[PDB]
Every structure is written in C-alpha cells, then in structure tokens.
Design a binder for these strands. Structure first.
Length: 199
DNA sequence: GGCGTGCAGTGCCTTCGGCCGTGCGGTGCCTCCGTCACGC
C-alpha cells in the first residue's frame, strides 16, 4: 500500500559477491519499490541508503533534502561492489555511530532494514551483538532480511533473540523479494506511529 | 622445547594502569578449524 507514518527507515544492502551484478540490481529495484510505497518527507518517512562491504558506503542520508524521485534515482544507481566481504558488524556499527549517533527525532520509529545475503568473516563478528544491543538501547528496530542460501542464519536468529521487535524475513532468492514487498512494507509501517505530536 | 600467550573495543572501572577477552585469516553456519610467532 502506501505508508504515511513517522518513520526513519534505513536500507542496508549487502555488497558482497554472493550477489551477482544482476541479482544486486534486483535488490536495488526492491529498495526503489519500497520507496515508492513510502511517504518520503522530513515529517513522515525518512530514508537512508547504504551499500556495505568491508565498509559502509552511504548514498542517501535521513536528512537529505531532495525530491523523492531524485532519491529513487540515486537509490537505483547504487554502484555494485561484489566484495569478498560484506561486514554486518561494520554496517551495524556504522548505523549506530554515524546514522543514529543522536536521536533527533523521538516522535518517530527507527528501523534498520538489514538486507543480507552472505556471511562475514567470524573474526569481524567479535563485537556484533554489542552493536545490535547498542541499537536496541537507542530504540532502533533491526529487521534482518535473509536473501539466498548464504545469508548468515546464525546472526539473523541472533538479531531476533536480541529484541522483541526484531523480526527476520528469510527469503530463498532475490526473486522472492518482489513477491514479499507488500508484506514487508506493511510490517514495517505498523511499527511506526501514525500521528505527530500535538505541537 | 614444549608450552602458554597472543587481543577488539567510538571498549570497561575501582582512572595516568587492570580487567575482559574471537592472537590471527579465512571457510562458510559459527562463535570456529587449523595455523603462525614469540618468550621462558
């Protein structure tokens, strides 16, 4: 449908080589479709787009004052990485420290849509749960989205085990996205308040 | 000549030096299998 609520949504795209050139474009299209079903505004739904590999490469910020159509273009032109490493620990650390360093919008919900499709090196996962728990303390909901046979199930279930609102969406392939979009959007929307503060 | 340790972290508390602890790279399910450098 169309989400018109106070929400800060953060898209986190796995940049590993697990996803092919094409398969990644599909993921991007999914993110674009999501955005078409969101009321993009500083006072309603704010969006952020981040392709992550060894590190986080942000294309869109929550405070970016741009026309939604423009943002959709940007989100569709996200460059393919195809890295050997897509650190979820790093992208969650980035989200926690860079994106949500300061909670400037209490009146809205904070959601991190973690689109993963691989397994990061175990040594990198050392402080993983600490970032997830750290996001929780800033009241940021993390929704893992498993894509493909290589998506780290252990971490995904570990995210759910961290917070009540943290639900996972285990998928079979990037094709399962389009036919799961509507369900996901509505789920995220129902986590955000509908009406602003009295002001 | 075996051991036992190694150390991340916008770290933490009992503050300017202990205490916890994935030495580390890389495979592919995981919190790990198999491996190297030092000092003694």
């Amino acid at each position: 449908f169309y989400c018109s609520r106070l929400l800060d949504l953060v898209f986190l795209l796995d940049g590993s080589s697990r996803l092919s050139e094409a398969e990644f474009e599909v993921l991007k299209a999914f993110v674009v479709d999501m955005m078409e079903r969101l009321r993009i505004s500083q006072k309603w739904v704010r969006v952020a787009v981040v392709e992550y590999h060894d590190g986080s490469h942000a294309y869109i910020g929550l405070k970016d004052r741009k026309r939604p159509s423009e943002l959709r273009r940007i989100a569709s032109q996200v460059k393919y990485a195809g890295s050997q490493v897509a650190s979820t620990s790093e992208v969650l650390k980035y989200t926690l420290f860079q994106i949500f360093s300061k909670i400037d919008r209490p009146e809205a919900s904070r959601i991190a849509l973690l689109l993963m499709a691989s397994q990061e090196p175990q040594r990198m996962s050392r402080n993983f749960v600490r970032y997830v728990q750290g996001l929780k303390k800033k009241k940021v909901i993390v929704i893992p989205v498993g894509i493909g046979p290589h998506a780290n199930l252990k971490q995904i279930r570990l995210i759910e085990k961290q917070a009540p609102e943290n639900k996972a969406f285990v998928l079979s392939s990037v094709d399962e996205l389009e036919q799961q979009r509507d369900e996901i959007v509505s789920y995220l929307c129902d986590l955000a308040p509908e009406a602003p503060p009295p002001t």
